[PDB]
Amino acid sequence: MRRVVVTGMGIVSSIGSNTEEVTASLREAKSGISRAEEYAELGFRCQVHGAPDIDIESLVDRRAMRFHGRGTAWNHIAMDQAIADAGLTEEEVSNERTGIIMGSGGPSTRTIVDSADITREKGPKRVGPFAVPKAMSSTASATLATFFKIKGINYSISSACATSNHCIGNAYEMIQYGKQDRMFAGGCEDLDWTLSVLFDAMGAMSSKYNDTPSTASRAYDKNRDGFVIAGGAGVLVLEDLETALARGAKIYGEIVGYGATSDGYDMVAPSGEGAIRCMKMALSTVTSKIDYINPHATSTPAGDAPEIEAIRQIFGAGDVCPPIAATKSLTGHSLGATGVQEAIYSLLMMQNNFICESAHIEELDPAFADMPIVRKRIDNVQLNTVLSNSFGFGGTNATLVFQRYQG
Amino acid sequence: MRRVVVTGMGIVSSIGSNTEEVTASLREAKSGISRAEEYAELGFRCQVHGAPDIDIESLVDRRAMRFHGRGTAWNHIAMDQAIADAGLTEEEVSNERTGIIMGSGGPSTRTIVDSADITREKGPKRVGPFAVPKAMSSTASATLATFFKIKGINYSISSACATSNHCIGNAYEMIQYGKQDRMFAGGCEDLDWTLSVLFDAMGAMSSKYNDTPSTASRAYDKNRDGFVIAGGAGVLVLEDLETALARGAKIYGEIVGYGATSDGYDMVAPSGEGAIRCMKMALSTVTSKIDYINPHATSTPAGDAPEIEAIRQIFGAGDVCPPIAATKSLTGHSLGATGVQEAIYSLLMMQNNFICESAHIEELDPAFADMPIVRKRIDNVQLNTVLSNSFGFGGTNATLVFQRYQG
Ligand code: NA
Ligand code: NA
Numbered sequence: 001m002r003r004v005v006v007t008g009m010g011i012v013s014s015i016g017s018n019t020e021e022v023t024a025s026l027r028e029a030k031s032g033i034s035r036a037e038e039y040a041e042l043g044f045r046c047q048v049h050g051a052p053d054i055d056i057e058s059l060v061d062r063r064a065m066r067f068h069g070r071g072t073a074w075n076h077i078a079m080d081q082a083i084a085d086a087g088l089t090e091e092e093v094s095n096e097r098t099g100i101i102m103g104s105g106g107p108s109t110r111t112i113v114d115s116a117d118i119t120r121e122k123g124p125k126r127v128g129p130f131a132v133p134k135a136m137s138s139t140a141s142a143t144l145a146t147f148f149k150i151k152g153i154n155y156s157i158s159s160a161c162a163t164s165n166h167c168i169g170n171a172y173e174m175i176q177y178g179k180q181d182r183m184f185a186g187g188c189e190d191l192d193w194t195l196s197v198l199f200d201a202m203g204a205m206s207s208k209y210n211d212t213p214s215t216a217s218r219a220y221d222k223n224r225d226g227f228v229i230a231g232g233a234g235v236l237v238l239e240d241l242e243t244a245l246a247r248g249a250k251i252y253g254e255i256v257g258y259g260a261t262s263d264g265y266d267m268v269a270p271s272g273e274g275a276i277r278c279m280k281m282a283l284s285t286v287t288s289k290i291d292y293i294n295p296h297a298t299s300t301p302a303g304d305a306p307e308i309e310a311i312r313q314i315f316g317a318g319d320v321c322p323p324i325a326a327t328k329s330l331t332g333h334s335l336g337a338t339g340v341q342e343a344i345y346s347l348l349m350m351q352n353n354f355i356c357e358s359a360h361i362e363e364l365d366p367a368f369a370d371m372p373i374v375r376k377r378i379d380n381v382q383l384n385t386v387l388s389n390s391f392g393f394g395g396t397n398a399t400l401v402f403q404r405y406q407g
Numbered sequence: 408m409r410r411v412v413v414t415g416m417g418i419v420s421s422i423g424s425n426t427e428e429v430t431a432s433l434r435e436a437k438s439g440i441s442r443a444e445e446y447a448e449l450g451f452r453c454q455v456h457g458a459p460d461i462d463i464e465s466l467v468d469r470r471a472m473r474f475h476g477r478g479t480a481w482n483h484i485a486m487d488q489a490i491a492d493a494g495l496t497e498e499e500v501s502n503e504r505t506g507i508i509m510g511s512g513g514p515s516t517r518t519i520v521d522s523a524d525i526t527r528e529k530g531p532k533r534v535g536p537f538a539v540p541k542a543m544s545s546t547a548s549a550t551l552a553t554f555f556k557i558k559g560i561n562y563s564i565s566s567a568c569a570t571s572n573h574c575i576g577n578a579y580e581m582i583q584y585g586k587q588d589r590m591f592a593g594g595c596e597d598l599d600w601t602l603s604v605l606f607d608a609m610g611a612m613s614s615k616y617n618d619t620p621s622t623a624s625r626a627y628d629k630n631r632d633g634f635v636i637a638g639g640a641g642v643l644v645l646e647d648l649e650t651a652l653a654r655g656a657k658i659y660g661e662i663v664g665y666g667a668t669s670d671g672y673d674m675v676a677p678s679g680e681g682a683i684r685c686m687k688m689a690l691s692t693v694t695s696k697i698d699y700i701n702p703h704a705t706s707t708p709a710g711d712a713p714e715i716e717a718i719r720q721i722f723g724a725g726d727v728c729p730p731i732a733a734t735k736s737l738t739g740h741s742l743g744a745t746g747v748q749e750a751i752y753s754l755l756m757m758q759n760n761f762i763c764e765s766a767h768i769e770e771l772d773p774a775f776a777d778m779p780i781v782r783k784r785i786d787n788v789q790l791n792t793v794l795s796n797s798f799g800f801g802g803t804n805a806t807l808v809f810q811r812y813q814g
Contacts, residue, residue, distance in 0.1 A: 156544070157563065195542070201536055277503065393540055
């Protein structure tokens with residue numbers, strides 16, 4: 001099997017509109033969470049969100065936008081960034097050896113709702129002729145594959161919170177097995193009340209911190225009370241190692257493990273044992289120690305703990321366990337985009353030799369007092385190998401391990 | 408790479424609620440298309456659909472239904488059928504070597520719309536706490552993986568019309584490469600105005616035949632005027648050959664090729680060249696001649712022809728070209744479910760030694776007069792190798808080739 005490296009990254013996040021902004025946010029523990037006035041207007045319990053702040057119209061032209069939902073527009077931007085970062089020629093983007101696996105946890109629910117509304121108010125024709133590609137689950141791959149003239153693999157993987165971890169992992173497999181030499185992998189999610197309300201109604205999102213929105217997402221805090229939803233996108237450019245080397249690519253890291261498992265247990269809550277198997281699977285092909293864990297931890301009572309127990313089972317507790325820092329405390333949970341975004345945060349931490357604070361831990365949950373949850377940014381750390389989990393609704397688990405490329 | 412066989416099938420279709428019903432419909436060219444009175448009420452141009460006729464509540468119990476949309480409920484039924492057909496024990500369904508890749512072209516758009524409506528009418532709490540797994544793009548995998556206690560791979564691939572062809576192909580790869588020994592693969596789609604309207608608004612669905620709904624889907628007819636949307640589901644049980652043999656499995660066929668490519672051209676229209684590359688890729692691992700092509704052909708002016716030209720390029724014209732019979736003329740286009748359903752129709756035709764009529768060709772389009780489009784059911788034919796295309800919006804292409812297992 002071939003080796004596979006990350007040669008470019010692009011990101012639209014609640015904590016920044018490019019990798020530089022994101023890095024600064026990570027370094028300074030700058031929360032991307034703000035009040036969602038619309039959620040309050042609609043009567044939600046949760047009135048916070050992680051909203052990107054980026055001018056789509058300035059970055060994606062009108063014809064390009066014809067078939068985009070906002071999530072995929074953000075993914076388009078991320079794709080442009082990743083292509084630029086990678087320094088790819090048009091030929092390198094568009095060829096039979098280059099594919100795309102790009103997913104979202106949902107499609108444009110706003111398109112779906114707006115279309116239903118307008119059908120009933122003004123008639124079906126007034127939906128307009130461009131809604132299908134926005135509304136379909138493959139929207140992220142369909143739109144980008146078409147616009148970027150992708151000729152290889154083209155589909156979306158969806159797996160809720162794990163979506164873009166699976167997208168990356170499957171793309172990794174594609175290249176490992178020699179089916180593609182380059183892949184664009186990642187995912188996106190719109191941020192819209194029509195999606196967020198589904199989570200609010202299940203009581204899944206934080207509401208106790210509406211008056212201090214910036215600190216609402218607080219993985220491992222004793223008083224965490226649900227996740228904070230976000231939107232955005234991320235893209236990695238993946239290449240087989242020879243391809244990367246031959247063109248003098250940047251190498252942000254090497255993908256060295258990928259785990260994917262299923263809990264087969266509960267729709268909304270993790271089992272824990274699935275995560276253990278997922279991490280073990282990811283680690284089964286990894287020879288070096290893990291220097292940092294980017295957990296799934298979404299700031300939920302029921303979610304943060306079983307993952308920590310899974311980590312304890314694999315890695316132990318205290319100093320021997322890799323440092324753990326939950327980036328969702330800063331970023332919220334962007335569902336389809338989370339996996340790739342977390343890969344990017346981890347690769348940026350690797351690049352910049354620091355591990356961010358696991359933010360907003362005002363009082364650590366005592367259940368986690370034995371674990372190396374990062375309470376203050378760690379500087380001057382040589383990260384060589386980083387592990388990132390995403391454990392999604394439906395008991396779907398994906399773990400990725402990235403390594404600093406040193407030959 | 409390991410060999411991979413189909414050991415069980417389940418299906419919920421506009422042309423039958425199980426494989427026996429489906430086989431009878433195929434044999435007798437019994438259309439599954441009917442008038443959609445609701446579409447007329449809503450002012451659609453297209454007033455036809457392919458609706459399953461199956462009593463969900465009698466087949467999936469209430470607790471089981473908690474997190475199902477209708478599409479995934481149909482997929483649940485199909486999964487139950489496939490498990491029964493395969494004769495799997497509970498242990499064989501639920502184990503670390505057994506996974507699920509099950510997708511839909513969209514999620515429950517009805518859940519999304521109903522939730523938005525009720526949020527605005529009665530408040531967000533009244534969405535209820537069970538909407539996320541119905542609304543998310545991974546709904547088909549999440550629901551089934553959880554209910555069936557799947558422990559291996561668990562995610563959805565979405566690729567519009569190609570969805571469940573990719574699901575099957577990726578599951579095939581999983582087993583080929585030794586990652587899983589058994590996979591449940593397939594997909595589903597609800598049939599609901601909230602999805603169908605998106606296609607009506609783009610003028611994609613047939614409207615000239617509303618007065619004769621049964622014949623509205625008419626691939627290759629000169630006067631075809633758009634596809635007919637359908638809902639349903641299908642599941643294949645895939646196993647590595649040794650696993651299948653060792654347990655005395657039924658073998659419906661062997662998956663012997665899988666192509667996946669991207670047009671990188673137009674969002675709604677096929678390029679043709681992508682399909683050629685897709686079929687070639689599928690055929691690259693196939694040693695026997697193709698005895699039957701189950702085309703993508705959805706009964707559209709712009710769609711049916713480029714695929715025929717692609718077929719002509721690979722296979723030639725006339726007698727030397729494999730017989731082509733568009734099952735969507737009977738079934739309509741069930742989007743996420745189409746690929747797996749067409750695999751099942753093809754495997755059932757293989758099992759039963761006939762090729763169905765390519766239905767509703769009242770006047771063949773003269774552009775296709777050179778091609779072996781099946782005008783009357785062909786009986787007493789030994790099908791050993793069958794090819795099925797699905798070429799979806801966003802220029803996403805998937806082709807599968809199945810072979811009669813003879814050692
Ligand atoms: Na993570
Ligand atoms: Na087909």
